[PDB]
């Protein structure tokens with residue numbers, strides 16, 4: 001990574017937008033949606049072709065219409081008046097900043113943030129985000145092969161589901177992973193380990209972590225050691241927020 005220089009005015013806008021985003025996301029109870037927005041923005045990166053990734057394209061109707069993005073229109077429209085207060089910021093940075101803030105305000109680790117991503121004109125093709133009905137090979141095709149993230153990243157990042165819930169009108173899955181879906185903690189992993197449970201969701205892709213010999217040791221470590229989860233989580237979210245950026 002070689003991070004670009006931005007003006008002092010750009011930096012001031014980042015700092016002030018970070019603060020506004022905290023109060024906004026906290027009062028609106030939308031941290032999970034905003035984290036999902038940031039992931040769906042970044043996760044389309046394909047290292048092979050250098051296409052996709054966290055470049056502001058998620059606001060384009062063409063990208064909002066991807067079925068994986070059901071409901072992200074709401075996230076995008078919720079942020080528009082606040083974004084209008086910071087016209088200097090790229091959409092790319094703004095949506096990644098909303099992701100970082102979503103983790104922080106729910107009590108998660110502080111993910112280092114570097115400004116300067118440029119807004120690209122071209123949304124990636126649909127079909128690159130993970131499929132919750134699939135298993136380990138698939139997650140490795142999505143996170144490893146396309147994104148260029150590690151197996152440690154895959155498991156730590158699945159920890160993002162520690163906040164939030166699925167919606168039957170969005171993915172078709174329904175419910176929270178955790179009893180405290182607005183609190184950033186290691187509950188995702190402890191829930192996974194205690195198996196199926198009334199009124200908590202587990203996806204087939206979550207189950208795939210429990211039977212992989214590389215993913216399972218990590219699920220165990222995060223279930224047992226929240227600090228270790230926070231540190232690996234922060235590292236993985238940083239890498240994710242920076243795919244294709246500043247290489």
Ligand code: HEM
Nearest residue numbers: 032033035036039130131132157160164165166167170171
């Ligand atoms: C590992 C592959 C992944 C799969 C298969 C997956 C799948 C899903 C699905 C199906 C939903 C439900 C959407 C809905 O119906 O509202 C969801 C929600 C969510 N995902 Fe993921 N996801 C993955 C990775 C990630 C990552 C890496 C993050 C970011 C750290 C993330 C953050 C979230 C959040 C915050 C929600 C909750 C949204 C809300 O409460 O409205 N996910 N995910």
